């Protein structure tokens, strides 16, 4: 769906995520953007979609993340709401469900998102520019 508004949806959510830091946003994900190997737009998206289902699934209720304060619980709940909202959107654009995450280094989620954010602002320029 190269140029659907789905991209803007992915984009407006990537900033709600990159704004709000939380306890867990320093946990790590397999840095799937550490290849050279190369994939195709569709699997980039499946691979990222995959990296994120893992994550939120493993940390929705992680003692290290839930928070103590009601500020903390709230940000956590938001973080997760948002990761599945991007998640939904990435698998929608993927339109493939096959995923062979292979890379090895890990990256904090915070950086993973920073990078999906760029790759995604770039798909966007290529759609108007």
Distance of alpha carbon 57 from alpha carbon 48, whole angstroms: 14
CB nearer a second copy, residue 63 or residue 125? 125
Taking the complex as a whole, the smallest distance from the CB of residue 41 to a second copy amounts, in Å, to 4
Taking the complex as a whole, the smallest distance from the CB of residue 107 to a second copy amounts, in Å, to 8
Which residues sit at the interface with a second copy, rule CB under 8 A? 31, 33-41, 43-45, 103-105, 118-119, 121-123, 125-126, 129
Distances (CA, A) of 112 to 4, 9, 55: 23, 18, 12
Helices 70-94 and 6-19 pack at an angle, to 10 degrees, of 150
What secondary structure letter does DSSP report for 77? H
CB nearer a second copy, residue 82 or residue 124? 124
Taking the complex as a whole, the smallest distance from the CB of residue 54 to a second copy amounts, in Å, to 19
- In the block, which residue shows the tokens 């003692």? 63
CB nearer a second copy, residue 98 or residue 118? 118
């Amino acid at each position: 769906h190269k140029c659907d508004i789905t991209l803007q949806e992915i984009i407006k959510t990537l900033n709600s995520l990159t704004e709000q830091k939380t306890l867990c946003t320093e946990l790590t994900v397999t840095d799937i953007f550490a290849a050279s190997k190369n994939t195709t737009e569709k699997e980039t998206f499946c691979r990222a979609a995959t990296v994120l289902r893992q994550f939120y699934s493993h940390h929705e209720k992680d003692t290290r993340c839930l928070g103590a304060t009601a500020q903390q619980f709230h940000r956590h709940k938001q973080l997760i709401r948002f990761l599945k909202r991007l998640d939904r959107n990435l698998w929608g654009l993927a339109g493939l469900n096959s995923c062979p995450v292979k890379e090895a280094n890990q990256s904090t989620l915070e950086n993973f998102l920073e990078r999906l954010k760029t790759i995604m602002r770039e798909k966007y320029s290529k759609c108007s520019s």
